[PDB]
Amino acid sequence: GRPRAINKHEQEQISRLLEKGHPRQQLAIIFGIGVSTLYRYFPASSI
DNA sequence: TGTTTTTGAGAAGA
DNA sequence: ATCTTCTCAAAAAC
């Protein structure tokens, strides 16, 4: 189908950055992906 | 010009 | 204003 937005490596990198306090808004602008996507890969209640 | 899988804007939150 | 979740047209790839 449509290529995913981020691979396991990226997912890790991000999941770690998100747990360090990085705002999804930022990480979103940075990793070239939309915010709703991040909340999907990592619900705020999933940290 | 057709199905599939995933994206991302935006809508709505006892 | 912020934050989070959820839907859903449709991009993205073949």
A45 touches strand C (CB under 7 A): yes
* Cβ pair A14, A35 in contact under 8 A: no
Q: In the numeric block, which tokens belong to residue A43? A: 């619900």
Method: X-ray
- In this complex, the answer to whether residue A43 has its CB under 7 A from any atom of chain C, a nucleic strand, is yes
**Would you list the domain boundaries of chain A?**
1-47
Burial class for A32, CB neighbours closer than 10 Å (0-12, 13-18, 19+): exposed
Name the DSSP class of A33: -
Backbone angle region of A11, left / alpha / beta, with phi > 0 → left and psi within -120 to 50 → alpha: alpha
Protein-covered nucleotides on strand C (Cβ within 7 A)? 3-7, 10-13
Please answer whether residues A30 and A13 qualify as being in contact, where contact means their C-beta atoms are separated by less than 8 angstroms: no
Resolution of the solved structure (Å) = 2.8
Fold adopted by A1-47:
Arc Repressor Mutant, subunit A (1.10.10)
Q: Exposed, middle or buried, A31 (CB in 10 Å: 0-12/13-18/19+)?
A: middle
